DNA sequence: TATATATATATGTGTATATATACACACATACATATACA
DNA sequence: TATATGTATGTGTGTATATATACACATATATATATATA
């Protein structure tokens, strides 16, 4: 078997080495008859266009290779290259230089190793790059190759490690790939997973692994596909998933909406989706050597494949949530808030927030904080804000649930009524609080926007007792520290 | 087995030259249909062979190539 | 991209909401365009010539879209928006 | 640069209406989560 | 495939807490909109 694929990229030199059986170290008869000299199989495999083991591909074959061209394309864009291959009895070293113009005779020794290695220097200058590569070009190319290796690591079998510059490549699952691609747009997000199986051979031999993230902050539909090892960017497998998800999304949208008239299409359905699809599909064809786009009849998937309904349901749920949210996000985007001049800056912890109870109270406080020279030792708006408590605070102690998970911890999940309270949303957005934080350390207690909340309430028994106790109860129930 | 091919057999077996050599779903496939003295561009919702359309296309673009090549000339 | 930049400008102008952010899909999903002509120096991604290859800046440096066309287009699109 | 639109703001004394929160408890409507199975 | 079974919402009463909005009327000013000039 192939137990490893070592890829490296350093000082411009690019190398790739695998450890299955090597390329046959043997004389090629017809190639030698053509060349009128002794030609061995690796020289045909690396220097003879339209040559390889896939000239006659089977309908069930899931290798990317088909044309007998790719390797010679690598050689033709190499200033120098070294093919090394060993079959357990011999090792074979051949040097192929000057864009396939100089093909040195090979050197054949005994060896008991078994592997194939291609090592080469591209013609970076001829291809538009600096010589040697600039800092930015080098970093860009390393990042791109590193990405391709991660993709291999998800596509390759489970006995095969993918190395890039000697470190192993982490991402052995489509979920790992999804998390990698969405680490910034949508960290800590929900990953819908599916294994799409078929019932008839050959398709039943090759399940498609799928991971999808669904986020409101995704601007367009997006997929990553590794099919037959090829990072292709267009193909009817994507459309299969898109159309299936859309049909379910339309059904449940018209169900959930009591408007019952609006008509959404695939762009609405899918623009918040990021999908990774990895696996093998037998019998596909491409639109060129690059293999950017696979070619197939759509019905292959309609006849043979089924997307598990749990995945479809999860996906439709997330998408229809976003749809209704987007319809009513305009009414979410008017509180009474006077920002202090130094709120959220370098002296943000020097600042107070005088949370008053109504609007007449804010009239009093704004009268008081503007005595400019009648109160030279008083406060002012350089370190003091104002906000309205909106009457009486909602309590959270009657509107929250401690639910027990599997690991042995009770997480405290709120209510949809408490979540949508306009007053408490205001003070959370003003103070910059976070619900999953705990603020035990001072490194966390300096990430806020003010230094203290100060309740300027009435002194009658209603305002002094009730809403001040409910404000204390809110802060105790969520952040006692 | 390692095989060496010629252009001819290669082009008959391999999709890199003109696209797929059998019927596949071609996204955006269109055709012109006449409806009572009106030309309409309509979708063709049926699989077709990309290589088959390419052999028409190759000749047609050769002809329009000749047209551009000669447009500032005498003949 | 050119049509989108103009569409975003005039959408924020015409809207007195003044907060909503639209992208290229919103800008362009109601457009059907035909583009015909010659471009010197292009390259392709294969024999089929499905995709032409070029530096984007070729157009940023050399070409200009007439403003009357951009204005007409932006008007129609913002009406729909 | 010009003549020309059509909408837009503010003042006092008037005409009409809207809406958020607390607090207790009997009662009504919505699943949904199992448990025999089937 | 029916059954319970433990979950979650949901108005409703009196006495409290804090707000919101449409319209008429005269006249001076305004800031961008518009022809056609070219």
Residue numbers in the entry:
A (entry chain B): 78 to 410, 415 to 562
B (entry chain A): 3 to 77
C (entry chain A): 320 to 400
Paper excerpt:
One intriguing example is the African swine fever virus, which stands as the sole mammalian-infecting virus encoding a type II topoisomerase. The ORF P1192R encodes a functional Topo II (pP1192R) which is highly conserved across diverse ASFV isolates. Prior extensive structural and biochemical studies have elucidated key aspects of Topo II catalytic mechanisms. These structures have unveiled the inherent architecture of Topo II, which is characterized by two principal heart-shaped functional domains: the ATPase domain, responsible for ATP hydrolysis to fuel the molecular machinery, and the central domain, which interacts with the DNA duplex and contains a catalytic tyrosine residue that cleaves the DNA duplex. As a result, Topo II not only relaxes DNA supercoiling but also disentangles knots and catenates potentially detrimental to cellular function if left unresolved.
In parallel, the full-length pP1192R was mixed with 52 bp DNA oligonucleotides, Mg2+ and AMPPNP, which was subsequently plunged-frozen on an amorphous alloy film (R1.2/1.3, Au, 300 mesh) at the same concentration. During the course of cryo-EM image processing from the dataset, we determined three distinct full-length pP1192R structures, each characterized by a unique orientation of the ATPase domain in relation to the central domain: pP1192RF1, pP1192RF2, and pP1192RF3. The atomic model of pP1192R-DNA complex encompasses a homodimer of the GHKL, Transducer, TOPRIM, WHD, Tower and Coiled-Coil subdomains, alongside a curving DNA duplex. A pliable short linker (aa 410-420) interconnects these two domains, accounting for the wobbling of the ATPase domain. Collaboratively, the TOPRIM, WHD and Tower subdomains constitute a positively charged DNA binding groove that accommodates a DNA duplex. The DNA duplex engages in an extensive interaction with the DNA binding groove of pP1192R. Meanwhile, the Tower subdomain presents an additional β-hairpin, referred to as wing-2 (847-860). This wing-2 motif adeptly intercalates itself amidst the base stacks of the bound DNA, facilitating a global DNA bending of ~150° and a localized DNA conformational transition from the B-form to the A-form. However, the ATPase domain retains a flexible conformation, which likely correlates with the energy transfer dynamics intrinsic to the DNA cleavage/stand passage process. In the full-length structures, a continuous wobbling characterizes the ATPase domain, suggesting a plausible correlation between the rotation of the ATPase domain and the oscillatory behavior of the central domain9.
